[PDB]
Design a protein around this ligand. Structure first.
Ligand SMILES: NC(=O)[C@H]1C=CCN([C@@H]2O[C@H](COP(=O)(O)OP(=O)(O)OC[C@H]3O[C@@H](n4cnc5c(N)ncnc54)[C@H](OP(=O)(O)O)[C@@H]3O)[C@@H](O)[C@H]2O)C1
Lengths: 285, 285
């Protein structure tokens, strides 16, 4: 099957190479440090001794390194190696990082798309694994069938920085969820209530219900029509002080939840207490 | 001809409660400070009480769903002889202390008293995924739980009359985390003119659903006071600058998510970067 090369053999790059081998692709691997190659040599990979050698083995080149700086250090070490190849860069970073990297690649005669892996290394290979892609549509089309070995492809558009924007937005969502878990569990723990049962039987079911409610809020964001949905900001601005006061009586810091309470209060002070929660998005933009 | 009930407060939530009692065949008497809000309920079979006194005299099970504890006290103190030998079920949002203060007054005026927390928005009332928490004397709860089971799934959480409110405010803080995450993520995609609806339905919800299951493992680690490799705080502390920098380039404020990033960084500086997210709970206690 179609050869592939993988540059960077940390946790995610190891899993990517492993899955290409499992599906029968001739897989060439490279890493700054040689030791991380050995688990992949053990299951049939070729270890390339140089960046040049890895680039010559395949026309599809996958880069999965620490950061954009490291990607640039790899590219600049063999600047004639990239011509007429397709580079698929799965290295985490900002939208700007992806645009800057694409500029260099184009100037050196390569084709370039950026991807964001929304998945833990163990999930690689499963349909559960969402991988976002951005950059020129024709470049993606030319390699998507091979890339579909790693997970479910989701192309998100032409601007090569979009996959990173989507990735970082999803991670922001997760950091909010974790903020809520932390505050809720601290409050019950302050009254010597075990965390396990509370989370399994009360917090997860409640978060599941409100996670579905997010589709209503998203519709209201698009329509710029911030109806209350039966839960007005005026009413919420009376429950939030109670959450703060009980937290303080229990000795629990309010640092993780006070920001959104100040937003809710600001909207009431603008005269729009009869709206609902979809109004907050525009306030931080 | 089912067991009579009285409902005090006909805002969005109180309207839904009264509606459900009528739908299930109960003689339902209703009262509101602003009397016009009774008319949609008279239209579906309710009796409108002209006074607090008359609403209290119509039933033995008396439900109050107004705004805050101050409002409940204003209602109680207007007819101090009306409450004797009744069961008051107070579903009005407040702190644990508010529930204890209210119960003291009720007991002194010859009433029985339970406090509850409605974990549902109005349209959810009557469906299986509506959870209502209850606390106070177990025999008082026993006397009315079958009637109350019309609103949702009863969850008794103990005898201290303040416990339902502690549980309620903890679950609400969980939800405000989730909503902080939605708000930041949708602002990021909206800053690049991406519709909220498709992103939320096909990318954000499935991601949040996966990460929600991970919360069981974190809760176990909280109980065992044993945190963690896994996803070490050290790695998380590498995603955060990418999210902050991309937010700044897009003109999106970081006020909703910066707190958790600062907590994480404090734990790394204590020498415990190899621990996991469950360590955060103890830090805010
Ligand atoms: N909606 C949701 O998503 C629910 C989520 C879980 C439960 N949650 C709680 O349940 C109650 C009622 O909420 P609702 O949305 O109905 O509030 P409003 O629509 O603003 O109605 C407030 C009511 O409180 C009364 N209220 C307000 N102040 C008073 C006083 N002082 N005395 C008596 N009654 C009072 C007011 O009477 P009014 O219509 O303004 O005349 C209304 O009947 C409140 O404590 C909420 O925190 C709500």
């Amino acid at each position: 099957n179609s050869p592939v090369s993988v540059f960077g053999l940390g946790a995610m790059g190891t899993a990517l190479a492993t899955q290409f081998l499992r599906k029968g692709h001739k897989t060439t691997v490279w890493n700054r440090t040689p030791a991380k190659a050995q688990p992949l040599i053990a299951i049939g990979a070729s270890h390339a001794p140089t960046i040049d050698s890895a680039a010559a083995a395949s026309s599809l080149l996958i880069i999965c390194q620490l950061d954009k700086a490291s990607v640039m250090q790899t590219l600049q070490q063999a600047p004639t190696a990239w011509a007429a190849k397709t580079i698929v860069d799965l290295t985490n970073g900002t939208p700007a990082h992806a645009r800057e990297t694409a500029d260099w690649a184009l100037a050196h005669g390569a084709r370039y798309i950026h991807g964001g892996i929304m998945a833990v290394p163990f999930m690689i290979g499963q349909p559960d694994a969402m991988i976002l892609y951005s950059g020129p549509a024709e470049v993606f089309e030319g390699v998507k069938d091979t890339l579909s070995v790693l997970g479910t492809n989701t192309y998100v558009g032409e601007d090569v920085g979009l996959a990173s924007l989507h990735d970082l937005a999803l991670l922001s969502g997760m950091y909010g969820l974790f903020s809520g878990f932390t505050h809720a569990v601290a409050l019950v723990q302050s009254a010597n209530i075990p965390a396990a049962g509370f989370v399994a039987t009360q917090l997860i079911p409640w978060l599941t219900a409100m996670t579905q409610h997010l589709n209503l809020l998203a519709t209201q964001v698009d329509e710029k029509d911030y109806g209350d949905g039966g839960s007005s900001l005026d009413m919420q601005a009376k429950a939030a002080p109670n959450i703060l006061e009980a937290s303080q009586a229990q000795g629990v810091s309010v640092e993780l939840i006070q920001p959104i309470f100040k937003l809710i209060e600001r909207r009431v002070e603008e005269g729009k207490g009869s709206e609902g929660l979809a109004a907050l998005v525009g306030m931080i933009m």
